[PDB]
Structure 1
Amino acid sequence: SRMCGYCGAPAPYATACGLDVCVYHTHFHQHCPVIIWCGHPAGSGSCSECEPPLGKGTSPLDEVLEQVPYKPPRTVIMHVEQGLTPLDPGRYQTRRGLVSVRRGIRGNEVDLPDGDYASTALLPTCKEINMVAVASNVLRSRFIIGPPGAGKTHWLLQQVQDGDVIYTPTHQTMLDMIRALGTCRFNVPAGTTLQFPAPSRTGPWVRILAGGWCPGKNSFLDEAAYCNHLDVLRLLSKTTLTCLGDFKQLHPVGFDSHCYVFDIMPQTQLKTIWRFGQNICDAIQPDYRDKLMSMVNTTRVTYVEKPVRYGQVLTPYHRDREDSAITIDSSQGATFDVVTLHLPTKDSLNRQRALVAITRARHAIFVYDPHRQLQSVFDLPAKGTPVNLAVHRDEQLIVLDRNNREITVAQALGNGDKFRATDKRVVDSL
């Protein structure tokens, strides 16, 4: 009992290209013949039963199939003896209608009486297509649109895991992906004119798109805008996809072809951040539609048990300002290397203020939060960095190492010195 590839209804018939169809859809598949009850193709007018004409496609599948040539296969004899035949297992049209050659321990089983039958095999073209699954899986998929510049390649590397599968359209894109991953599984395709490395034993699979679905945990689609539309539908019939694409420019002058599914897929626009690290981007994400990707290093986050004066000090209320400290409201549109979020007063912090305070610093932020009130507004875990930090403190240069100790030496630890301020740079040398 087979179901229709279009609508999922019971399917007694099939297209020559391997699509199971219900009675209704026997007459809306212009791609190739559909042998119906009278033994002729629907709409052929070979007899009076097949005179009603074919209708226009009811599915995007039909539009996709306009670029997929039907090549009629050879008419081959199927020899039958006690329900056994030499022909390969599959599905065939015969004078007794559509029949299946099943694999078995005794042999290739076929439910037909002894004889010889002229047989045309169904092509594999739409053997794995299921448009009700495509619809469902499209909803549970995502299309990651990249930014104008770079970074889209590095998003994938942070997301990919050893159990995952990455589908890619060409030999070259497959090679590009394999080089970017470093360690991955694959089978070098026959006939290729590229120099493929050796495949690893572990890592994500890199599969050529034309090869079709193979099982995995998460499935990705590389170069989505370049991919074969029918192959994409084959995948979406079996799994959901994370589909990677580039920034949509205004080029359409017949210059844009991509699978229709991407225009109805849930979309995620990537945005490059140059001001602070990824850990900050993650904490602030709830306030933004775009997925924020840091194109710079991790911003340090340290939870001090006692007050401190590193970099610019920030605090909600004027009452708690000391020395050259400012309010969080006064810090809007200002940028620093180091910042100290000073929160002595209970219930003094909301989302808006906290968002401003967290997004001022470039390299480090120290948070004095004795009331533990930042937790109730933000998820911001403590993050260290193996770096030698440096900043002024009331007309006096000072430096702190990776373990947040006030060391005053000349490059003793042997770590990097991160700083972007005008005064900190020039004073650093001399």
Structure 2
Amino acid sequence: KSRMCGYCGAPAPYATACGLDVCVYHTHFHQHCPVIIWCGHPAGSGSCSECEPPLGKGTSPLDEVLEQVPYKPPRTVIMHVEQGLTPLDPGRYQTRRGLVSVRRGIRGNEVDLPDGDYASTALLPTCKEINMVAVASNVLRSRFIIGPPGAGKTHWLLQQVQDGDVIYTPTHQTMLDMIRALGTCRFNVPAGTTLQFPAPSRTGPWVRILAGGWCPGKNSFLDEAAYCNHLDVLRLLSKTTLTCLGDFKQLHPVGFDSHCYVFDIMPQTQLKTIWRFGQNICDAIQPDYRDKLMSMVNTTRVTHVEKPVRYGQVLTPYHRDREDGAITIDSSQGATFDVVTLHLPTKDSLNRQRALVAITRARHAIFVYDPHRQLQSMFDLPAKGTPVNLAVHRDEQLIVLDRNNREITVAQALGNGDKFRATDKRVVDSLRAICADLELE
């Protein structure tokens, strides 16, 4: 029945409002939110003889991380205490006589408060289940795998996960992405997803949304780690070690300056062999990666157009510029296409991470429309030729670009004696069907 302190796992009679469990000493070293102490007041408040002592800065990295998660206090609901029953929700409240926990009874909700009216604040779930001792060691027992785009980190996970293992992943979407590279996996469809999830096949490794806390398994993995909420990572490292796959040079987490500090003190190894694009792309993105990248595939065509084009998937920075099937660059992390157009109509719109992702989505050809010459400032991606015939869909119509980017017909492509380049199944199926009809007409 006794809680241990999340900073100093000594006995923890108290709790922050956010709410981490603190000991008698650490009540004055959590400047992130108030902590009510032995007297009815919060520490630091000059309200009496006990809350008079001043607060101090905390030495934990947890403190430094809360500096980017501002405390939004919820408003006081009031505590109407029966004989022992009260009409309130789950529990974990700070009244005025110390911490109070109301427990789920189906014969009413029971509290160990004598009959009266007490003003009560709900505790947040921000630092619940965080144990900074456990984190301190576990992080040193964990590993981080830098998978650049197209190095197949997401695949190495498959040739290593076993069915008693748990895979954590940050968003509903990345969750789904992982379900499908696995196939048979166990999971729960998140409350309030706006997507359609397969059937939870009940004989596979587990897949869980990072925000769900820790769940026991044998080995645990963190998918798209450099992107994950800092506090939910810590909630994991308070209970297990982790095998972390991600990339610092792509997108940062959505409410934070950079990636969580725990990855910076892990041992880090980086995949160097790339299965998705040509060496010219690899060379363009090399500055962001320590070890040399070696491309297993052909030169990816690079073309810089003067006026906008619509070849392949169109990627664009800002939502307002999306036309006719295009998508945001951010929404394309993890995705792969044969051909992308990089659509840059709006100025000061392309940050270095957003540029990385975009020039590494395509396999065979990228078309860059960069009137404000933004991309040259971050990546040296010179125009590059391929002596092949590109095949891509556009408005459900197979079109063919020759080695000089002229739209020609399937028939003319067979005439010019250059091979077709394409990987997408539907493109390749349209391509093979059409060549049949040409011969049988």
Give the TM-score taking structure 2 as reference length.
0.58
SS in 2 for 1:282: helix
Provide the rounded CA distance (Å) in 2 between the counterparts of 1:78 and 1:119: 6
Q: Deviations over 1:178-198 (max 9, x none)?
A: 222222222333443444333
Q: 1:221, CA displacement in angstroms?
A: 0.5
Q: 1:26, CA displacement in angstroms?
A: 0.9
SS in 1 for 2:232: helix
Provide the rounded CA distance (Å) in 1 between the counterparts of 2:368 and 2:146: 35
Provide the rounded CA distance (Å) in 2 between the counterparts of 1:66 and 1:398: 53
Conservation of the 8 A alpha-carbon contact between 2:152 and 2:274: no
Alignment CA distance shift 1:349-1:24 (3 Å): closer
In structure 2, runs of 5+ residues without a counterpart are 431-441
Q: 1:385, CA displacement in angstroms?
A: 34
Query: Which residue of structure 1 lines up, in the alignment, with residue 210 of structure 2?
Result: 209
Provide the rounded CA distance (Å) in 1 between the counterparts of 2:362 and 2:55: 66
Provide the rounded CA distance (Å) in 2 between the counterparts of 1:65 and 1:55: 15
Conservation of the 8 A alpha-carbon contact between 2:169 and 2:207: yes
Conservation of the 8 A alpha-carbon contact between 1:389 and 1:417: no
Alignment CA distance shift 1:107-1:414 (3 Å): farther
Conservation of the 8 A alpha-carbon contact between 2:390 and 2:422: no
Alignment CA distance shift 1:155-1:75 (3 Å): same
Q: 1:99, CA displacement in angstroms?
A: 1.9
Q: 1:48, CA displacement in angstroms?
A: 4.4
Provide the rounded CA distance (Å) in 2 between the counterparts of 1:375 and 1:413: 36
Alignment CA distance shift 1:186-1:399 (3 Å): closer
Bigger mean CA deviation after superposition, 172-181 or 267-276 = 267-276
Q: 1:343, CA displacement in angstroms?
A: 63
Provide the rounded CA distance (Å) in 2 between the counterparts of 1:394 and 1:100: 60
Provide the rounded CA distance (Å) in 1 between the counterparts of 2:34 and 2:319: 80
Q: 1:231, CA displacement in angstroms?
A: 0.8
Bigger mean CA deviation after superposition, 103-112 or 249-258 = 249-258
Conservation of the 8 A alpha-carbon contact between 2:147 and 2:271: yes
Give the TM-score taking structure 1 as reference length.
0.59
Alignment CA distance shift 1:251-1:353 (3 Å): closer
* Structure of higher CA gyration radius: 1
Conservation of the 8 A alpha-carbon contact between 1:388 and 1:401: yes
Instruction: Give the total of aligned pairs.
Output: 429
Q: 1:239, CA displacement in angstroms?
A: 1.9
Q: Deviations over 1:23-70 (max 9, x none)?
A: 221111111111122211111223343233321122111121122232
Q: Deviations over 1:405-428 (max 9, x none)?
A: 999999999999999999999999
Q: Deviations over 1:147-191 (max 9, x none)?
A: 574231221010112222111112221222122222222233344
Conservation of the 8 A alpha-carbon contact between 2:387 and 2:418: no
Alignment CA distance shift 1:200-1:293 (3 Å): farther
SS in 1 for 2:293: strand
Bigger mean CA deviation after superposition, 166-175 or 351-360 = 351-360
Provide the rounded CA distance (Å) in 2 between the counterparts of 1:343 and 1:91: 50
SS in 2 for 1:101: coil
SS in 1 for 2:280: helix
Conservation of the 8 A alpha-carbon contact between 1:268 and 1:291: no
Q: 1:298, CA displacement in angstroms?
A: 25
Bigger mean CA deviation after superposition, 210-219 or 96-105 = 96-105
SS in 2 for 1:425: helix
Identity percentage over the alignment? 99
Bigger mean CA deviation after superposition, 106-115 or 64-73 = 106-115
Q: 1:220, CA displacement in angstroms?
A: 0.8
Alignment CA distance shift 1:386-1:243 (3 Å): farther
Aligned pairs for 1:102-251 within 5 A: 102-104=103-105, 107-146=108-147, 149-246=150-247
In structure 1, runs of 5+ residues without a counterpart are none
SS in 1 for 2:349: coil
Conservation of the 8 A alpha-carbon contact between 2:150 and 2:274: no
Query: Which residue of structure 2 lines up, in the alignment, with residue 340 of structure 1?
Result: 341
Bigger mean CA deviation after superposition, 153-162 or 375-384 = 375-384
SS in 1 for 2:118: strand
What RMSD, in angstroms, separates the aligned Cα atoms of the two structures?
Answer: 17.1
SS in 2 for 1:313: strand
Q: Deviations over 1:106-160 (max 9, x none)?
A: 5533222222322112222222111111113212222122257423122101011
Conservation of the 8 A alpha-carbon contact between 2:149 and 2:360: no
